[PDB]
Subunit: 320 residues, 2 copies
């Protein structure tokens, strides 16, 4: 029975497969694993299963016990792992890049609906016990049906958003540098725009599902906001650094933007302090893939990786 | 210009039409209208536009000056008007009963979604600055796709809901007293249940869209709850007296029900005190029809009834 260190508690179905295959050292999270704990514990274990929370920079990869020739990361990304360093040392890394499409689409829909319908301010009025009863002008939002949704980025997640968005009778327009199949645009009656500027124009609702690129970093800013229709509503579930916070906070205040629904922020969890008191925001602590079905696919996937190192085959989601 | 009293501030478009055709006394919500003030002011005007907040029962219809033979209620119901006493005294009464179907279906879908995805808890974590950053078990809920939705009451709102739910890939099973036409059912691949019980049994998510009626009043109680799957989620946008508050607070606390998303409460705004603290609830201050598109259809309809009275024609939404 090979031994593995699991740095954080995962969903029970994941943990249980792990314990039916390995001698697991499961760490809790109260006082999360410090890297030095990992480096230490690493010596009694054959393999690591880490989260994006363990930042394995070159320095740390070089500090790792030579016992370990396997790191599975419970994540879609690997921004926290030096894959070069791992590769030179012959440390094989894999990841868990599936099972989060629908879950994220759902949250993008939720944020669009909750923003049109002022759910955050609703919740507050009740919890805070400041509800005087129904009046005709109290927390009045707007309906989604026959409003235009501009989706920037029309891949798996942007497409599943369009599915859930056509159920509310929204009109779906998009821009991506990859134009989807005709068979596909038809599926959603999605209108392609060959330019971002062309899309911002028609976008009463705007969804950032775009890939982060140095060139697209902070693109959502003052100049981009002024191309949106007045009182436009923007949601972001992609990458917090696609948005320039100062300019978003300023337009929400000016009403240039009606509402914002953000799942991800630049600098999370130390999000720009302006967000906290803005009443026209609906804000989540990165719970895009926070669904049990998603969180277990990721875990079974991170387990598949380990399985295939110890089985002597190629890692199913081979990063290194 | 015939004078009218409008008891509450209404949307901007409706107020504008009102003051086009009428000399309007507009009463603010600052210190809301009291009955006496309404009675005193009815002497100086030709008709009343009131809301559901003005309870015009017999003892108040008794006080009404002989000049008022017109009453329009910005409201879908008329529980607050003694329609008899009105007929007896020759007072013609109409309501505004359209333009809330989609708005309410949206709010029912938002509560199903924000419940599965624990949206109230997210907003609370951000706003309180209690967010430690992403972790695999932070605020994990469940996806809606391929889950079964049970709808109690397949009217207009029930079917705008099934539409919006089949976009999230839910399976709609339903119970209504009069089974729906063969074509409705196909629209939504809905599955008919010949009893509420055989419906309750399959309902991982459950939506009360039933009418408030002697037999349905307080129908949702411990014996119904136990008939649902373990940890089902229940939303109610219909009426608060359809739900036995004591037995839902208990079952939510047991975990017998996972979540409840409610728009309406027995006693609102004086809702059961044991809701405020429950973390597995997503709760709104009754904003099922709080979209500016609905709120304005409603006041145009309410103005319609007054145009007809002064025209010699029947009110379009004649109650009495």
């Amino acid at each position: 029975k090979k031994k593995i260190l699991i740095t954080w508690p995962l969903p029970e179905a994941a943990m249980a497969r792990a314990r039916e295959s390995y001698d697991v050292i499961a760490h809790g999270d109260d006082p999360k694993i410090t890297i030095d704990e990992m480096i230490e514990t690493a010596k009694s274990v054959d393999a690591l299963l880490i989260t994006l929370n363990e930042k394995c920079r070159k320095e740390v990869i070089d500090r790792i016990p030579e016992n370990i020739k396997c790191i599975s990361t419970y994540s879609i990304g690997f921004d926290h792992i030096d894959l070069d360093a791992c590769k030179a040392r012959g440390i094989k890394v894999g990841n868990a890049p599936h099972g989060v499409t629908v879950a994220t689409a759902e949250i993008a829909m939720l944020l669009l609906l909750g923003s049109a319908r002022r759910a955050g301010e609703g919740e507050k009025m009740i919890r805070t016990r400041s509800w005087p009863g129904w009046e005709p002008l109290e927390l009045v939002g707007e309906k989604l049906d026959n409003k235009t949704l501009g989706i920037y980025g029309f891949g798996s997640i942007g497409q599943a958003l369009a599915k859930r968005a056509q159920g509310f009778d929204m009109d779906i327009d998009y821009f991506d540098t990859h134009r989807a199949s005709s068979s596909d645009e038809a599926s959603y009656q999605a209108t392609f725009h060959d330019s971002l500027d062309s899309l911002l124009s028609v976008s009463q609702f705007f969804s950032l599902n775009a890939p982060s690129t140095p060139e697209t970093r902070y693109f959502f800013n003052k100049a981009t906001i002024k191309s949106l229709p007045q009182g436009a509503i923007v949601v972001n579930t992609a990458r917090g650094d696609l948005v320039d916070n100062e300019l978003v906070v300023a337009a929400l205040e000016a009403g240039r933007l009606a509402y914002a629904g953000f799942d991800v922020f630049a600098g999370e969890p130390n999000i720009n302090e302006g967000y906290y008191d803005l009443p026209n925001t609906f804000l989540f602590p990165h719970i895009g893939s926070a669904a049990t079905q998603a969180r277990e696919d990721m875990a079974h996937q991170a387990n598949d990786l380990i399985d295939a190192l110890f089985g002597g085959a190629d890692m199913s989601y081979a990063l290194a």
